[PDB]
């Protein structure tokens, strides 16, 4: 039998199964093959089109094809044109979502297939889904690279640009998930999904630097991408790779994100452990279940409640459905990985479960269900009973996605094609080939990091450069580089904003956002003129920490590490450094000399750096091109001077020279009269900015902080820090110690958080805004470079940290009055923050250590499993400080590693006023957990009262001191706090005595 | 654009004027008229027009055709440059002899030949002593290699250039025939010092202070080392006369 | 031992064996390493 017979068999299979139900009006396949359903999905039709394209490519190998490939190619093109037309029908939603990402403005994903219009409201489906758009873009670029023609005019290029800009911000907004249910509770909440972000990373990587018209194109067929978004996407993936979601330990949806459709996880070992875990935990006799405890279209369900009631999911376990389609995906992964043994075993497994038509055509049903007779018997022994086929397994109903994947699996299995043909963009590469790939691996090899970066020395003024030359320092004035130009970062921002404008539809282009160091590290050419920019850390900033040399040295070292670790583009990066004359300012001129001498030496903290003349470096280097533009103490107090008249405050402001008095008088004038008032020097805002800049020049930290609080200006980096804190798994609350606090559980827009923090600031204090900014940026930097330092802490509260550090400073002061924190330079505040955040050692009072640990809300490792296992072996429950935690709901709603149990136990434990009391409690809980797990014979008879135990332990400790040192009964247990938990007579001994006294009775 | 028209016209004029007698393989242009000779000074000076034209093309190329034009102009320049270098590197014995003592008999020939780069005259039929030609040659060599063309390939050429540096470093106390190859004012030529040669050599020695011949991808031994006292002596001699 | 040692060994082998007898006037190697052929 020649190839003609098998190819004709595949043709008749496709005609009888896939192409039979195509809609000629639109070209989109429907979700249901019977009953005249008007609902159509995006994934199914795209998969069918991909299968048809694969079959056409397979049949292309015959010169006498008789036009069969013609029909398949035009069917794929018609499907692509229909889906693009439907996407481009909705234009307002794209623009709205580009500015304010919300479910209301999300692009619709379900629409009537007869006329390409929406048929259902967004209040019943959500409609927010990005994996579909990413997969559509990936398949479209794949088909263009194959040799097909998909786009006609320039407007579609602008639409693709706007879609790329739209999907660049996927790493923050939560998604409803591939299964549309999202959380396992199915209550109406959105959670982050690793599969969507992985698909987005793959699509952004593929779309970079590609001609869209195919064979022909000069300057209007390219796509521009930002490396910063790609870096954030890869960071989010690497952080969230082990667990798909906070509420899902594992899911079956991970396979497509980490197999043929994506091919994104280039780490082998974590790929191996992930595949092993998913296979071990999701394997079934009839296929792969969606996830554990999945109540998805099972026997017990009823069609009257969209959202599941609490504790029903517990009853829903054990009766999960089986989807044999994933056997096909594993077959595909095996056949690309060159492991025939998996091919044979999986084909043998899928052989009996497959069904036949009247003519014997293969059938793959959707899901498998158990009859109502075996509802309880299957629970005792998993898999003894035999399930029953679904409705789409006998006749009249099919699953187009299923037969498409089946036929593509058979086409790959029978060797009629090769892996290269079906993947023309080399998405998958072997371990021996990953040597000189772009945007994935460096030229030095995967397990190597020895990059050399270039630096350019440019001065500002002739006086500064001659002064540096007198000491042997070589630097060049900006007037000697006339062929080259140096421009700030806002020029590139406005240039990028100019791009992506269309008049017929109405598009705002790329939003005005800051450009990262990686983007500015390149060299640009506009209007034929070379433009080079320096990092944002160098420009003038109103804030105060930019005036400290140690801050700049640490920041530039961090930037050098960042450029070293996250650079993969061909060619050495370019770094620009500018020295200012006011920086030397007399005595502080030594550290810059040391830093520049180290820079001239060649190595900066283990990083190799090369320095030479700028024109030499720019010559012989690749320059990025932008051709779009051508085509297109105080003596004044608040209370005493509050009631003074306006003329008196004006004259006092005029005749006073103290900075603090001037600032406070300006504040009184602003709060009483307003910002529009006119004073001796012009407007009130003008005086505020002028005195603020004067204080910044003179470096009065209290004055600059007060002026910055007046200016109501905020740093443009809070959002990355809050997003990274959320993605790590920690919690951050904004507020003041002893006052109201706001908890943030999901990412929010900058406007809302700014309004909340400014309202709190107006309520309580004056300089806490800038202090919180400084602490949050320092916390972000210390957690970014030293993540292990924050082990054990989950809720990061700025007020408790500032109180703890103030207490530590007061302790250090001793007899000397405690130094005010508002007058401290950034150097000592970062030093003291690192000191208090240290793991801490002995020598100091244990009460202070317990105070610091409790203020940080530190928890011991493995505490959460310990309290859960206590609860499993606590028939009644635990009451702490008036809070009740019944065992039935927590055992019937949650599981071992679920984070909701963590938040509930933390909420229960957070009512303790004294944090030292809290750490006494947590130590007692650790002790009781240990002593219980070491002996299973002894069990509790009723609920334990931790207050009772701690009080009797205090009584025993008091009796011990009374007998030993002859100390009378003293109120408060600070003496118990001072005693270390371990030693000759530690707190652990008293707690254990508590445990035995409670168990024995 | 107008600039394109002007550059095309200038290229046409240069092509019709000087490039028509480029004499490939050897790369040495004839020294005008029907003389069948190649004077080093004229060959060095006749490349500045092509050089400036190519640099004008390079910055505004932005197209395959203009990229190719700049490429071919630079390759013609390096051809002519290597053609000059070969004739001297073929004659290391004379420079080695000149390195000790000063005499006209042990001096480099001033008029090299066409194809096969041979000698045309002996040592008693012409004035074979012109420090200005070698100095200005090395000056343009330094300028071109600072621009970014690779001219030097083998490391032995570095040693030859270092030897030539010592060959020309004694120009402040060595009498030469002169730029006009006519000796002093009257004939029956007697060697006599002139300010032109010393002034030409001072900048040539200054240019090669640290300028490496391997570009940005050099090594520990890629820079020509020069002293400083000879430059000051040349400056003093020039100022005096 | 990193690649530097092996590559330096290859460099010294090449310098002592192959590039030692190169003729700078033409860049062509001779057929005999002795006798001035």
Coordinates of N, CA and C in Angstrom, one line a residue, chain B residues 157-223:
Chain B
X157 N 54.9 42.5 10.9 CA 54.7 43.9 10.4 C 54.8 44.9 11.6
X158 N 54.4 44.5 12.8 CA 54.5 45.4 14.0 C 56.0 45.6 14.3
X159 N 56.8 44.5 14.2 CA 58.2 44.7 14.4 C 58.9 45.6 13.3
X160 N 58.4 45.4 12.1 CA 58.9 46.3 11.0 C 58.6 47.7 11.2
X161 N 57.3 48.0 11.7 CA 56.9 49.4 12.0 C 57.7 49.9 13.1
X162 N 58.0 49.1 14.1 CA 58.8 49.6 15.2 C 60.2 49.9 14.8
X163 N 60.8 49.1 13.9 CA 62.1 49.4 13.3 C 62.1 50.7 12.5
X164 N 61.0 50.9 11.7 CA 60.9 52.1 10.9 C 60.8 53.3 11.8
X165 N 60.2 53.2 13.0 CA 60.1 54.3 13.9 C 61.5 54.8 14.3
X166 N 62.4 53.8 14.6 CA 63.8 54.2 14.9 C 64.5 54.7 13.6
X167 N 64.0 54.2 12.4 CA 64.6 54.7 11.2 C 64.3 56.2 11.0
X168 N 63.1 56.7 11.4 CA 62.8 58.1 11.2 C 63.0 58.9 12.4
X169 N 63.3 58.3 13.6 CA 63.4 59.1 14.8 C 64.6 60.1 14.9
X170 N 65.5 60.0 14.0 CA 66.7 60.8 14.0 C 66.6 61.9 12.9
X171 N 65.4 62.4 12.6 CA 65.3 63.4 11.6 C 65.7 64.8 12.0
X172 N 65.8 65.1 13.3 CA 66.2 66.4 13.7 C 67.7 66.8 13.6
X173 N 68.5 65.8 13.2 CA 69.9 66.0 13.0 C 70.5 65.3 11.8
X174 N 69.6 65.0 10.9 CA 69.9 64.3 9.6 C 69.6 65.2 8.4
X175 N 70.5 65.4 7.6 CA 70.3 66.2 6.4 C 69.7 65.3 5.3
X176 N 68.8 65.9 4.5 CA 68.1 65.2 3.4 C 68.1 66.1 2.2
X177 N 67.9 65.4 1.0 CA 67.8 66.1 -0.2 C 66.7 67.1 -0.3
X178 N 65.5 66.8 0.3 CA 64.4 67.7 0.3 C 63.2 67.2 -0.3
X179 N 62.1 68.0 -0.2 CA 60.8 67.6 -0.8 C 60.8 67.7 -2.3
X180 N 61.7 68.5 -2.8 CA 61.8 68.7 -4.3 C 62.8 67.8 -4.9
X181 N 63.5 67.0 -4.2 CA 64.5 66.1 -4.7 C 65.6 66.9 -5.5
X182 N 66.0 68.0 -4.9 CA 66.9 68.9 -5.6 C 68.0 69.4 -4.7
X183 N 68.1 68.9 -3.5 CA 69.2 69.3 -2.6 C 68.9 70.7 -2.1
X184 N 70.0 71.5 -2.1 CA 69.9 72.9 -1.6 C 69.4 73.8 -2.8
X185 N 69.5 75.1 -2.7 CA 69.0 76.0 -3.6 C 69.6 75.8 -5.0
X186 N 70.9 75.7 -5.1 CA 71.5 75.4 -6.4 C 71.7 73.9 -6.6
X187 N 72.1 73.4 -7.8 CA 72.2 72.0 -8.1 C 73.6 71.5 -7.6
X188 N 74.0 70.4 -8.1 CA 75.1 69.6 -7.6 C 74.8 69.3 -6.1
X189 N 73.6 68.7 -5.9 CA 73.0 68.6 -4.6 C 73.9 68.2 -3.4
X190 N 73.8 69.0 -2.3 CA 74.5 68.6 -1.1 C 73.4 68.5 0.0
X191 N 73.4 67.4 0.7 CA 72.4 67.2 1.8 C 72.4 68.3 2.8
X192 N 71.2 68.8 3.1 CA 71.1 69.9 4.0 C 69.7 69.8 4.7
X193 N 69.7 70.2 6.0 CA 68.5 70.1 6.8 C 67.5 71.1 6.3
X194 N 66.2 70.7 6.5 CA 65.1 71.6 6.2 C 64.0 71.4 7.3
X195 N 63.2 72.5 7.4 CA 62.2 72.4 8.5 C 61.0 71.5 8.2
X196 N 60.8 71.3 6.9 CA 59.6 70.6 6.4 C 59.7 69.1 6.9
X197 N 60.8 68.5 6.8 CA 61.0 67.1 7.1 C 60.8 66.9 8.7
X198 N 61.4 67.8 9.4 CA 61.3 67.7 10.9 C 59.9 67.9 11.4
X199 N 59.3 68.9 10.8 CA 57.9 69.2 11.2 C 56.9 68.1 10.8
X200 N 57.2 67.4 9.6 CA 56.4 66.3 9.2 C 56.6 65.1 10.2
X201 N 57.9 64.9 10.6 CA 58.2 63.7 11.4 C 57.7 63.9 12.8
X202 N 57.6 65.1 13.3 CA 57.2 65.3 14.7 C 55.8 64.8 15.0
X203 N 54.9 65.2 14.1 CA 53.5 64.7 14.3 C 53.4 63.2 14.0
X204 N 54.2 62.7 13.1 CA 54.2 61.2 12.8 C 54.6 60.4 14.1
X205 N 55.6 60.9 14.8 CA 56.1 60.2 16.0 C 55.0 60.5 17.1
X206 N 54.4 61.6 17.1 CA 53.4 61.9 18.2 C 52.2 61.0 18.0
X207 N 51.8 60.7 16.8 CA 50.5 60.0 16.5 C 50.6 58.5 17.0
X208 N 51.7 57.9 16.9 CA 51.9 56.5 17.3 C 52.3 56.3 18.7
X209 N 51.9 57.2 19.7 CA 52.3 57.0 21.0 C 51.8 55.8 21.7
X210 N 50.5 55.5 21.5 CA 49.8 54.4 22.2 C 48.8 53.7 21.2
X211 N 48.7 54.2 20.0 CA 47.6 53.8 19.1 C 48.0 52.4 18.6
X212 N 47.1 51.4 19.0 CA 47.3 50.0 18.6 C 46.9 49.8 17.2
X213 N 47.5 48.8 16.6 CA 47.2 48.5 15.2 C 46.2 47.3 15.0
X214 N 45.7 46.8 16.2 CA 44.8 45.7 16.1 C 43.3 46.1 16.5
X215 N 43.1 47.4 16.6 CA 41.8 47.9 17.0 C 41.4 47.5 18.4
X216 N 40.1 47.4 18.6 CA 39.5 47.2 20.0 C 39.8 45.8 20.4
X217 N 40.2 44.9 19.5 CA 40.4 43.5 19.8 C 41.9 43.1 19.8
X218 N 42.7 44.0 20.4 CA 44.2 43.8 20.5 C 44.6 42.9 21.7
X219 N 45.9 42.8 21.9 CA 46.4 42.0 23.0 C 47.4 42.8 23.8
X220 N 48.1 42.1 24.7 CA 49.1 42.8 25.5 C 50.3 43.4 24.7
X221 N 50.6 42.8 23.6 CA 51.7 43.4 22.7 C 51.1 43.8 21.4
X222 N 50.4 45.0 21.4 CA 49.9 45.5 20.2 C 50.1 47.0 20.0
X223 N 50.8 47.7 20.9 CA 51.0 49.1 20.9 C 52.4 49.5 20.6

